Every structure is written in C-alpha cells, then in structure tokens.
Ligand binder design. Structure first.
Ligand SMILES: O=C1Nc2c(ccc(Cl)c2Cl)/C1=N\O
Ligand SMILES: [Ca+2]
Ligand SMILES: [Ca+2]
Ligand SMILES: [Ca+2]
Ligand SMILES: [Ca+2]
Ligand SMILES: [Ca+2]
Ligand SMILES: [Ca+2]
Ligand SMILES: [Ca+2]
Ligand SMILES: [Ca+2]
Ligand SMILES: [K+]
Ligand SMILES: [K+]
Lengths: 361, 145, 361, 361, 361, 145, 145, 145
C-alpha cells in the first residue's frame, strides 16, 4: 500500500509540474504576442528584424508548449492505467479523449508564424456607412485566437486545489459519492467567494476584451475612437452594463463580435453580482433575533403611549362636556379629533406589533 | 329599512359562521372559522368573544345579535371596541380593574402626561361604586352616556 | 337595528353614484381635450369658433366635475359623522382631509380655458443641437395635466369592489383586523390577476404617453419623427424596455420627462411581468408529483439496463481472456472500454436517481 | 374491450401521420418562399418564369396543406365522437372549434400568389429623416406572414410526446387529475431541459428575425446596413440583449416591429436564462453536506490556532513585564498589540463558526 | 463604579461633538466650492478678488477640518486606551489605524488652493470626433474630489445611532455577540426603511453626479448639451436606468467616468428597488388568510352551480330524447353540447379548488 | 384489436401498480402508489376506488378489470365519473341518496333554476327515488341509458 | 514510498473518523460522521460498511485497514465497488445469491440482449459450485481474477 | 459620576431582563430572554452565566452587579472574557483544569510553536499551587487586571 499510494502521488506531482510549465509557456507566448502587436504598429515595421525575432520566439514557445501538453496527456494516460487496473494504454484512447487532445493541440498551435503576409480588409464605417479598405497583416487573425490558451489557468486551478488533492476531502466525499472535477471546484469557489470570483473574471475580461477590440479596430480607425485603449475600455464597460454604445460602434465585425460576447457575459454576470450584493445586505440570524427583540420593545412602548393618549382624550372630552358650566365647543371638538387620532395610532401600532410577531416565527 | 337583498346578504354572512343549522352560531363554529383564519384562540378568548354580543345570555349568537354586531363591524373603526382594547392594554393578567395608583402611574408617566390636578380627579370622577378600582364599565360610561 | 344599516347603505349608494358621475365628466373632459388638440393643429385654427365651442364645453364639464367632487366630499363627511358617532361636521376636518380635498380640486380644475393665448417656446434639437423657436399656444400646458384626472378610476374601482362592500367579507376581515382600503384591493388584484393588471396598465400607459409625447413634440418637429403617433408608440416601447432611443430623442423637456417616467415605470413593470411568467411556467404540486413518479420509473429502467451492460461486459472480457484458444487483444480491449463506459453510466444514473430522491422530499 | 382501445389507437396514429404531413408541407412552403425571396432580388426578376414556377409550387404546397389540415380536423372530430360517446358530429362544433379551424385555415392560406403585383412603399430613413419611395412587390406582405405556420411544430411536438400517449403516464395522471395538454408538455420541457429549450428557441428566433428584418429592410437600404444578413443578426442580438441600436436602426415599420418583438422576447428570455444559470451554479445537497463538513474542520483548526496565539501572547506579555530585570517597553508593547490581534482573530473565527453552524441546519 | 461608565460616556459625547463639527466644516467647504465654481464661470474671473476671498475661506475651512479630524482621532485613541486597559497610546497604532488616519487627512486635505493656475485640456468631441483644446484652470481637478468628504455623513450617522449607544441594545447584543459597527447599522436601515434609504441615496447621487458632469463638460461644450444642468440630470437618469445615451454623450473622460459610475450604481440600485416594490405588493399573512377564505367560499358556490347545471342538462337530454312523441334532435344536440360544457366547467372549478387547498397550507 | 406491443405497454402500466407480481392489485398497493403521488387517502376511499371497477367481485383489481378502466381513463374526460362527482357534490351526508326536497332546492336555486313543473317531472321520473331517496343508480341510468 | 507528510495527511484523515484516540474506527463513529454528512444509515448498513475493509476481524477498522481502503478511494472510480453495486441492483432481497433463472431473465431481457447460448455458457461458468445460485464471490472472481 | 438620565437608561436595560417587580435577575428571567434571542441554553450554562457576575452570592444578579457587568459589556470587546473563552477552547473535558501535557501540546504543536524552554518556564510559572493542573484562575492572574 505504501508503494501504491506513493506512485500515484508521484504521478500527481509530475502532472502538476507539467501543467505549471504549460501555463508558463502559454502565458509567455500571449505576452510576447501582445508586445509585438503593440510595437509593430509603431516602433518597427513588419519587415524589421525585431518582428522576426519576437515571432520566432513566439514559435519556439509554441513548440515547447505543444511538447508539454503531449507529455501531460501521456502522464494522464499513465495515471489512468494505474487507476483503472489496465496494462494497455490503448484502453484509454476513446474517441472523446482523442478529440479533446486534438482540440487542445489545435487551440495551442495557433500563433503568428514568422513571415510578412498581408490581406485586403474591407469594412463599413459606423454611423457614416462609408467603406474602408486597408491592407492588413495576416498576423492579427493568428494573434487574437491566442487568448484561447487561458483554459490552462482552469487546469492549474483544479490541480492546485486542496479539495482535489486532500486525503480527508476524498475520504469524506467518497461517503456522499461526490464527483471531484473542475465543475465541483468552480461551484465551491462561487459558493465561498462569489464576489471575488466575479470581480476577477470581470476585470480580466474587461482588459482582454478592450485590448482585442482596439487591436481589431485600429485598422479602420483613423479618428482615435475605438482604437483608443481608454475608449475601448469605456465601450466594453457600457456594453457589459447594457447601457449601450455611445458614438462607439465598432467598424469591424471582430469588434462587434467582441461587444456581443461582452454583452452576453454581462447579462448574466450583472445578475449574479446583484444577487451576491442582496445576500450580503441581509442580516444574520443572530442579528435578526436582536433586531426583532429591540423592535418589539419599541412597539410595546409605543402601544403604551397610544393607549395612554386614548384614555387621556376620553377623560378630557368627558370633563369639558359634562363638568364645565360654560361648555366650550371648540375645545371639545379639538379633544374629539385628538381622541380619534389616538384611536388610529393605537390601531396602527397594534397592527405593526402583529406583523412583527408574525415575522418573529 | 333593509330590503330583501340586504337581509339575504347578511344571512349568507351569518351562514359563513353557522355551519350547523342550529339557527344560532354555536361556540365551536367561531373557533373553527378563527382557526381557518390562521389563529389559535383559547376557550377563554372564545367565550369572551361569544359573550358581549349575546343579549339573551344563551351563550350563543342569534341572527339579531349578529345584525347588531355587524352594525358596528361594518364601520371602518369602532370607538367602544378600541376603548376596551386600550383598557385591556393596562389590565394585566385579566384583572378587570386598574388600581388608582397604577392608573395614576399610567396617566402621569407614559403617554401624553396629564397635570397632577386632573390626575386622581379622573379617578374621583370615575369609580361611581366607590370601590377605588376602575372597571371597564366606567371607561365605557365616560365616552358614552 | 334595521335603520342604521339601511342608512349606511343609502349613503354608500349615493357616494358610488357621485363617483360614477365624476368619472364620466372627467373622462368627457379628457376626450374633448384630445379631440380639440388633434383638430386645432389641422382642421381649424385656435381663433375659430369650433375651438371656442369645444373649450367652452370643456369648461362646463369642469364646473360640473368640481361640483360633483364637492358633493362627494360632503357625502363622505356625512358618512364619517354617521360612523364615528359625531354630531358636528367640524370634527372631520383634520388638516389632511382639507389638504386632500384642495389637492383634488386643484387637479380637477386645470383645463384649457377659452381664449387665444400664446407663448414663446425655445428648444434645442436632438443630435444637431440647433435652436428652434416657435410661438406655442398656452393650451398645451393646461391640456397635458388633465391626464391627472385618472385617479377617479381608482376611486370607482374601490367603490365597485366586492371586498369593500360585501357583508361577508367585512365580517371575516374584522376577525383579522384587515384594513379595507384602496391598497388592500390593489394588492388583492395583483395577487389574483397580475398579468391582466400589468397588461392593462402597460397598454394604457403606452397610448397615453405616446400621445403626450406627440402633443409636446409636434411644436418643434418638422420632420415627422417624434410627432408621428406610430413613431411615438415605438419610442415609448423602446424606452419602457430600456433598449434605448434610436434616432428618436425628444427635442423638448416634456418629451424627455415623459420618456424618463416611462423608463422608471418599465424598470419595475418588466421585472414584475417576468416574475409572473416565471411563476406561470412552474408545475403545480400534483403535476410535480406525477412528473417525479414518471422520472423515477425511467431512472429505474435505466439503472437496470446499465447494470445489465456492466455484467455483460464483465462476462465477455472474462470469456475472451481465459476461455478462447488464442486471445484477440483488439476484442478484449474493446470489451474493456465498453466495461468502463458501462461503469460510468451506472454511476451517473445512480447519482441522477439520488438527486431525484432528494428533490422528491 | 380489445376493439375500442385499438380503434382509439388507430385514430391517434392517423392524426399523428396527418400532423407530420402538414408540418412537412408547411415547412416546404416556407423554404421555397425563402429561396424565391432571396433569388428574385438577384438572379431573376419577378416577371421571369423561375419566379412563376416557384410560386406555383408554393401554391400547390398550400393547397395540399389546407387539405391536410381539413382532414386532420375531421379525424379530431371523429375521435371526439368516439371519446365523448356521441353519434352526431354536430355536437363537436362549439363556436370555438369553428373559430380555431377558421383561424388555422386563414393562417395556413396566406402565401405569395402567382403574378406580378407591385405597390408604392414610402419610408423615412433613420438618423437622416429623409424620405424613400420604392415600388415594392406585393409578395413580401404575403411572404412574411408565412412564418406563422410554425405552430405545426408545437402540434407535432405534442403528438409525438411520450407523456401524451403512454398507458403508464395516463394511468398515473388520472389519479392526480392531470390535464395532458400542450401547456403541460411545455412546462415539463421547461422543467427538465430549460437551457436547451431556451437555446433552441433563441437561435431559431435569431435567424428568423434577422432574415425577416433584412427582407423588409432591403427595399429602402442602399448602403448595406440593415439589409446585410450579418448586420441584421447583430441588430437582433443587441435588441434582444437590450444594449440598444448602434447605427443599426430600421428604416421601415416592419423592421421596427420585428425589433420590438425581439426586445419583448429578450426581456423575458434573458431573465429565464439567468435563473437557469443561477440554479446550475448551486451545490447539490450532498455537495453542500460535504462542503459544510470540510469548512467546519478548517474552522476548528483555525479556532485552535487562534486560541494558542492568545495564550502565547498572554504568557509573553507577563514574561517581558515581570521576570526580567530590565523591562524593554518596545517588546512589551509589540506583544500587547499581538495579544489584541489574537483576541480579534479568535472572535472573528468563532463568529464564522457560529454562522456555519446556523447554515448547517 | 461611577467614575468609569461615565468617563466613557463623556468621551463618547466629546467624540460625537467632534464628528458634528467636522461634518459642518466639510459641508461648508463643499458648498463654498460649488458656489465658487458656479460663479467663476460667469460673474467674476479667476484673477478677481471674489475668487481669492472664497478660496481663502475654503482653505481656512480645510485647516479647521484637518484639526478636527486629528483631535477626533486623538479622542478615539484615548477611548481605545480606556477600553482595552492600556496605559501607552502606542499600542493603538497598527499600520491600519495609521493608514486610515493618513487616508482621511489626504481625502480632507484636497481643495482648490488660492492662486491662478491653468493647464491645457484636449478632448475629442462626441459623435463628431473633432478635437477641442481649452486652457482650463487647475481648480477643477482639486474641486471635484472634494465630494469624497461625504464619508463624514456615515461617521455622524453611526455616532448618532440609537443601536450604537443605547445600553439596552448593547446588553441584548452581548448575548448574541453582535458586532455593533457601521455595517450593522447600514444593514439595519436597509431592513427597516429600504425604500427611503434607496430614495435618499439615489436623489443625492443624481444631483451630485449631474453637477459633476456639468462642471467637467462645461469646458468643451459650446452648444449647451452636457453643460446644461437639466440635460445633465436627464443624462444621469438615463444612464442610471441603462436606457442609454441620447445625443448626450460626454466629451470628456471625467463625464464618461461619472456616467460609468452612475451605470454601475444603477445596475444594483434598480434591482434592490424592484425587490422592495415586489415585497411591498405582497399580502400580509392575515390578509392571505382572509383572501383564501373568501376565495374558497366563492369556489364552493361555483362548484355547486356547475354540478347543478350538469344534473339539469342530464335531465333535459333525457326529457327531449325519450318522454316525447317527436324528437327535434336540434334542441337535443344543443343540450348535449351544454352537458359537455357543464362537465368541463365542473372539472375546471374542482381543479381550482384543489389548487387553492394546496396553497392554503 | 390490440397488438403485442400495446398489450406489453398496458401490462407495464399494470406493473406500476402490481409490485408484488400476484397478477392482481390489492388495496395496499393502490394506497402506496397514491401516497407516492401525494394524495394520502383513507381506507374507505381506497376501498371505494378498488370497488366500482372490480366486476368479478374478488375485491381486488385483475388485469382485464384494469384494461376495462383504462378504456375510460385514456380519454380526456369521462361522462360517468363526472356525473358521479356531481352527484357526490350534493351527497354531502354520504348516504348515497338525495332527498327529494334537497334535489328540488338544488335544481330550483343553484343552477339555471328549472321551473317547478320541470322539477316535479324530474323527481317523478327518478325511478330509484324509493319514495324520496334518489340514489346514484337513477343518475347513471338517466344518461347511460 | 510514503513520506512523513503523506503519513500525517492520512493520519488526520483517519482522525476525522477517529474521535477518541482508541486507534480504531468503531461503528458508532462512522454512524456519527455519516449522519453529519446528511445520511441515515442503518445498523446493518453500517456493519456492512465496516466489513469489506476489516482485514483483521477485530470488528472495527484499524489504521492499516483504513490506509488499504483509502488506496481504492483516492481514485476517480473503483471497479470492484461498482461490480458489487451492479450485483446488488439485481439482488432485490438480502440474499447474497441470484437464481440462474433471474440472471437469464436479466441478461436476455433488460440491457444489451445477450445471446441465449452465451447466457447458458455464462451461467455454467459463473456457477463454479454446484449450486445454481450465483454468489457475489463468483462475480468478483470473474473480473478480479 | 452618572446622571439620573444614565441611571434611568441602565434601569430600563435591567428591566429588559427583570420582568417581575423584584430587584434581582433570576436564572429563568435570563433563560426566557436568551430563548427569545434564538438560543437554547441549558441550566448549567445559565447557572455559570449568573455565577460569573453574581457578587455577594444570593444566586441572583442584583442591580449593582448588572452595572458592574455592563461596565464590561458596553465596550467593543473585553479581555478577561476572551481569555476565558480561549481557555475553554482547550478545556474540552470541562473539569476547569488543563493538564501540563495538554498545555505543552497545544503550545508547541498548534499556534506559534513556542520553544521547549519557554513552554517549561510557562508551565512552571503557571503552576503556582504545584498541582500541575492549570486552572482558569492562573490564566486570569497571569494577565493581572
Ligand atoms: O468512504 C468510506 N470511509 C469509510 C468507509 C467504510 C468504513 C470506514 Cl471505517 C471508513 Cl472511514 C467508506 N466507504 O466504504
Ligand atoms: Ca351554531
Ligand atoms: Ca343569543
Ligand atoms: Ca399485487
Ligand atoms: Ca378482480
Ligand atoms: Ca475510535
Ligand atoms: Ca481491524
Ligand atoms: Ca426577577
Ligand atoms: Ca447578587
Ligand atoms: K438595458
Ligand atoms: K440600453
């Protein structure tokens, strides 16, 4: 048993390290892509040697990333053989697993290849419906889908989770037959720290979406509107919130697609955030008990005051009616009005007391 | 004067309480209706409510007694019932009477305080029997004649 | 007694008739105002005699309406005297009854008085920020507030209600100390027929607000945009739904105020309607029981099928492993993959059955 | 006996087949209408023979569809006679069956009749308020209402449902007096598969609404804005989400009506989808139990740590106050601050434990 | 003892008075800033002596405010020493107390210093994308962040609260370990008076944000659009409600930031308000009981009527089929249709009755 | 005539109630199914449901009896069951008979207010009246035959 | 091989069930943990769970027995437990055996229809003993060995 | 000193627990309040809470004892109460004494990992009586007052 558990733990450690390295190399590729995209518009041309150097560096990172993913899946299959008592790796090779491995390699293989390739881009300007033709480099079509590499963050998050790796958690969850997967960890995080999860997701989406909007829009924007980073940030914020475009309509279908994706994400994230805030503005059960106690005390005091006023006004009416030789009708009318007011106050305060006793159950 | 339609409406309202055709609301039909209305009245409370409305002392509400009660219940608010409620606010433990000291304390401390001249002058004016403990009869007799 | 109840019933009938007449005359005044506003822009001028005839008719209706309001309040005070054992009518006046009577008379007294009075109106056009000066008649400022007369509908609705007038309802409501006011009747209607109430309110608001927008916007609109009735209907619908203005921004602050009021109303009415729809898409308790029963039956069938497949694949693996003269590795691998699939299906169907047994409580 | 039940089964099978054929012919008519609408704008004119051929084919499909609907309703009336023990078919006709049959025939009878009929269409352009006059063919007014034929999908969905026709389901539902109609099946689908139902409905509405928007807008659009299919798809998506209109405002009241209908549908579909997502992000009851257990374990550990720190600082404060010849006040102050911090940590962790014990039951 | 618990009360009173004075001086500074900002655009220039007088008055108020803040924190530290049995004030400094004291001094120290300093401001106009260069005074950058002083309102609200200082409330809350802080008082207010809190917050935000938008936009607005106070009010209202922008788009990033903050606030405040309204439209438990009782009575009457109709038509079909010399079959068919109708009515009313009995418990 | 698949479907529906496999449905099995459906019945109601459909008199439901009752339950609505329900609406006592006075009151007041001659003819034509106590047999025979 | 940290992790996982320091998990402790986990296991079920893990039949789970079962439980899924579950699906009663007729019915009717000759071969090979009732040991030995 | 208004405020706070007209808070007038506050304390817990405040014995809290404890409850947080709570965290047995081995374990293993010499010095200084079972009195006296 000592060797059997140690082998699985060593395989877990190797697989976790491979995930960490894959995330490091994917993020390195994304960062160098962002730097090269920003700098080739300005500092250097696409025929410069700086462009070649940075894109060759991107391609080397991509090769290492693909190797790391393949070795990670080899370790996954080896762990599968260890777990499900198998001696042939070909048992693990279902159609679903092959398809997902191929999808992962396809997603992580897209990058701007070294070279100088251009294409013709035609778009209709917003609010003026005028055409715009530019000769755009192909590298933008290959750079934008590099943001799909962020699933490696989810992989690392699952593999570094304490729930997924702890022995106590596994032993307890075996009793309830809990399925320890990425969905369970995500739902647990949305349960304990919903505001933090939504905040991190929203800020990262905001920056990524604004940058990709300006990267797409800079080709047909010669007026510094949607190619402005701060303007793109504002556009993403107001489509997220569904206030709407101002004069900030994208000129390109890439920008429109990003804005649509932002609006779809916002339609749900806003409601989730509002539910979180509504829950956080609610009193705790102990605080509810204390508040009900203090309110009931105040209601009792007000009931006593109202009843005292009722009796006082009844006495005053009787006195000024059948006790004074000169019956002043104005005084009697005033006291009768006050008597009716006191009756109404007593009725209303008793209704409030009844409602509070209802919610106190 | 009431027409036939009005008498029919009041009769169906009476039937909403008179499940049994006894011609009178028993003291258990009121309990069943009140429990249907999300309440748990006690036997003492049920007897108190079934009283104060029956003038024949039979312990059961008739139709004319129901009409007399509805004469007050159809209003937005009733003065006598609310004076009785204000009386029961300070009549702890269902005593039926309030001591002069307690009444003076109530009228001087809580609520809009009276001047000490009118305090105990109210008690002197009340308590016609001279017992010294103010009953619910005196409070009703103040506002009424 | 048989006299007090009859007297109160007679007073109720008189109040009900007075409310009916007040509503009839108020609606007559509003309808003639709408007709005159529509026709003075086109058919006849403001200095013609058709305008004078229709406005004198409006003023006569307003005088009769004010008389009816005053007599209604006299009957209300008389019934108050009957109820609260009072002999002096001056007990009724409580600095709040007087204020509400004065407010009601002020609201019902506004109408376009006969005459030909004009004023200068300056507005900034939308999307072009160009000034527009017109000489407008004063009658629009006096016509638009006439829509405030629709509280008489609420008064009639309360007075015609069964809950407010029925003897059985009062007898049972006195046991719970229910307050039979307009709020209670409106809440009861929103509980019984929420969709119908919201639909009627929304359609009436739509038509009234669209007409108000058209009446305000026709002065500074010479392009048939917001002075179009159908365009105003569309504008009200898209500000109600918070999609936003198209090219339909009002040129006047009257139109902007109407659109803001429509947006505020829509922000709440939409959510209420959605709650109604969500409730109406929910299964009844009996339907829930039947559905849970049938789903549990299907789950049992699927559990049995999955377990049968598990046993079948176990047997097939054993046979092709230790019963055939030469072992075909491809066949054994296929059956081992199918065995693992069967195990996964059994686990998933059992957890579905467990979830259903949880919600079945 | 064994004959009446078989007769009912045969009648139901005939009804099901007639519904299938009616759906096939209605969808064939819609598809040929879409093809002819797309091709007559481009390839051939309205006076061509391809137009005549396709419209005659549409009319033949419509005749067969009307015949199929009439025979279907005859089978309905025959099954009604079988069920409600009737011998005269005239008992079936109830001023509502007749009305719905007539409505169904009217809906399924609208189609673009063969011929070359044109009318004058005047619309005001968006954002520029300029008129546009075109001579449009009448066939668009007859093509767009053909999408109303999609209720046949609901009919087929009811008739192919397992709940509607299954002895077990009917026998169980007869105990709860369940009414097996289209509403029940729709509610059952919205309970089992809400996300799938909403997704299918939204995608189909998206494509249909975008196509009908461009079909209406292509007459007054000579700038490729709202007559663009991809632009129309974006417009429908952003009015569904209530972000707004960009520069994409319909020039026609047909487009405005479609956008309003899309906005009304979106206002409810978005909220329903968000409720579905919120429910799907929630932990299962077993997962809740496991999570509460693990959190309570961590809370106990943290409570023990906090109490240990409290005792440690209480000791060190004394040890550095007394027990030392030269009292270093800086260190004593540091340990007193740490003691206060430890007290606060203990209080906070104990209140977290109290909250968790409250939500644990 | 009498010394303590009275010394603490005296310290409480001193601290409360210091908070009151700090709020008075902060609000005085804000009001004079608003007056000077309004008047320097018009009446007098920035090189005038009225400007110098008002800004020197602002600076004196700021000095007194900083002194009051420092003395307040000295009283806080003294009360801390009294409570946590400390003799050295240095125990109170925990880098968090220091950080928050520094934050308060930094926030309250920002004000428009006397002088005439100008800077160059360049902004891109909305909807036209044209540049605008103005020489703006520095005082706007120093005036706008003066609205951050409104946290003193929260401080005063906590210190004047009954829950915070009442002996009964603290004695009761000590049995539930209730933490009496600003969050608890805010949650209590949101539980007692949610509509009033939201209304006050929304109106104050509306006016403050509209004035801030006007103050920022007046520099690049020469068309009276967003520098109009009433237009700014409308803009804030329609971004709060997420209807959108009309032609009212800020030319400055200050205005865009204010509009974004308004939209974020509105996205949550609107949902909270709608929840409040939905709760306030719901019947009380006693009202629910009364309504269920009355509805059950009506449904019983309807059940009796439906059953009587069923029996009546069953009799009439027999009487017109048999017991007659000649059969018309037309009246017989009519009565059979009415019999089926009565059966359906009885079924539906019984369904309503059982549904009501389900919701009755 | 029924095919093999239809007979299999109906046998499966029968098995939903015949858990033990005895080939017959007892009272306990029906009670368990109904309580699973959240309709907790009494012994009297369960016995009444088991009766009214078991033609062989064995006291338990067979398979052919199940087919016979499914012939009615597969329909959207049934006339005999609803006439029995309308009869039970006015048979509040539970005796199974309707008095002539109560029937006349119901027919003249509740529904469409039949004329007195029509009600007299109806009550005379009620053969199961038994000199006043109209049974459920007459109501069924009026429509069925 | 296990390290000190891994041994400590497994020891604390054991302590989650070992309340007292007895060094062994009894039935009551497992019951308390499971009831804390929102279940209501029976004494028979708790005894069954204590069995199948107890290497040395002390009647209670030891630490090495806990480590041995954790070896299986740390995996995503276990074959033996699921084969036992599939066995218990068709074992309606508490007997540890299934009749040959029941197995033939199961394998020919429900699930993937196995060939009748294949079913005969399976029922012959599985029944290692002369008894025609297949035990759980045979099913486990079919796959494990 | 205290103003008469402050004395009145504290008197009404005292009246929130002293419902009866006496001048002492009993063990049941505290249980009623704590059960109204959503707690379910036992007789032992109520007695301990009374005893922690009850000077001069009498088994009941007086008014001056209430003032003395309010002097501690009015502040944001106390120190002696939290030291007692930290002590009770490790006094799971309830005997009121912590063994020297238990203190060494809880101070070396969990927390901030005191040095062995520091733990020895602390356990020697705490054991003033030399018994070796550290009580709550020693912990309170360590922090002085
Ligand atoms: O998950 C499990 N943990 C268990 C089990 C059975 C016995 C024991 Cl002692 C423990 Cl700790 C379990 N299931 O067999
Ligand atoms: Ca009675
Ligand atoms: Ca009587
Ligand atoms: Ca059976
Ligand atoms: Ca039978
Ligand atoms: Ca143990
Ligand atoms: Ca053992
Ligand atoms: Ca006492
Ligand atoms: Ca004492
Ligand atoms: K919106
Ligand atoms: K919008």
């Amino acid at each position: 048993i000592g060797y059997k558990l140690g082998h699985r733990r060593a395989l877990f450690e190797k697989r976790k390290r491979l995930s960490d390295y894959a995330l490091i190399f994917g993020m390195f590729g994304i960062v160098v892509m962002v730097i090269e995209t920003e700098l080739s518009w300005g500092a250097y041309d696409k025929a410069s040697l700086y462009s070649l150097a940075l894109k060759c560096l991107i391609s080397l990172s991509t090769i290492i990333l693909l190797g790391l993913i393949i070795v990670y899946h080899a370790r996954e299959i080896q762990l599968f053989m260890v777990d499900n008592g198998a001696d042939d790796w070909r048992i693990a090779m279902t159609y679903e697993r092959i398809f997902f491995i191929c999808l992962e390699i396809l997603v992580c293989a897209i990058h701007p290849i070294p070279g100088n390739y251009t294409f013709t881009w035609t778009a209709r300007l917003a609010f003026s419906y005028a055409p715009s033709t530019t000769t755009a480099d192909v590298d933008i079509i290959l750079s934008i889908p590099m943001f799909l590499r962020l699933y490696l963050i989810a992989r690392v998050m699952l593999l570094h989770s304490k729930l997924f790796t702890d022995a106590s958690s596994r032993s307890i969850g075996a009793l309830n037959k809990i399925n320890f997967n990425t969905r369970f960890v995500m739902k647990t995080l949305m349960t304990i720290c919903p505001g933090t999860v939504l905040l991190v997701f929203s800020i990262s989406l905001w920056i990524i979406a604004a940058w990709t909007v300006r990267a797409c829009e800079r080709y047909h924007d010669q007026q510094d509107v949607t190619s402005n980073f701060l303007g793109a940030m504002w556009l993403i914020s107001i489509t997220f919130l569904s206030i709407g475009y101002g004069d900030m309509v994208p000129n390109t279908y890439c920008g429109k697609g990003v804005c649509l994706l932002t609006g779809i994400m916002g339609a749900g994230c806003t409601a989730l955030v509002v539910a979180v805030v509504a829950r956080k503005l609610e009193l705790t059960k102990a605080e509810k008990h204390v508040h009900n106690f203090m309110m009931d005390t105040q209601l009792t005091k007000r009931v006593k005051n109202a009843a005292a006023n009722v009796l006082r006004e009844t006495w005053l009416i009787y006195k000024n009616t059948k006790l004074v030789k000169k019956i002043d009708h104005a005084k009697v009318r005033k006291h009768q009005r006050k008597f009716l007011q006191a009756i109404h106050q007593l009725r209303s305060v008793k209704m409030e007391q009844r409602k509070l006793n209802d919610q106190a159950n | 004067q009431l027409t036939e339609e009005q008498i029919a409406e009041f009769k169906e309202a009476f039937s909403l309480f008179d499940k049994d055709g006894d011609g009178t609301i028993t003291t258990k039909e009121l309990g069943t209706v009140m429990r249907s209305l999300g309440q748990n009245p006690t036997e003492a409370e049920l007897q108190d409510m079934i009283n104060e409305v029956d003038a024949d002392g039979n312990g059961t509400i008739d139709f004319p007694e129901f009409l007399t009660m509805m004469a007050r219940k159809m209003k937005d608010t009733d003065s006598e019932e609310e004076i009785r409620e204000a009386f029961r606010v300070f009549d702890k433990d269902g005593n039926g009477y309030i001591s002069a000291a307690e009444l003076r304390h109530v009228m001087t401390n809580l609520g809009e305080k009276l001047t000490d001249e009118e305090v105990d002058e109210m008690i002197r004016e009340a308590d016609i029997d001279g017992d010294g403990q103010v009953n619910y009869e005196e409070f009703v007799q103040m506002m009424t004649a």
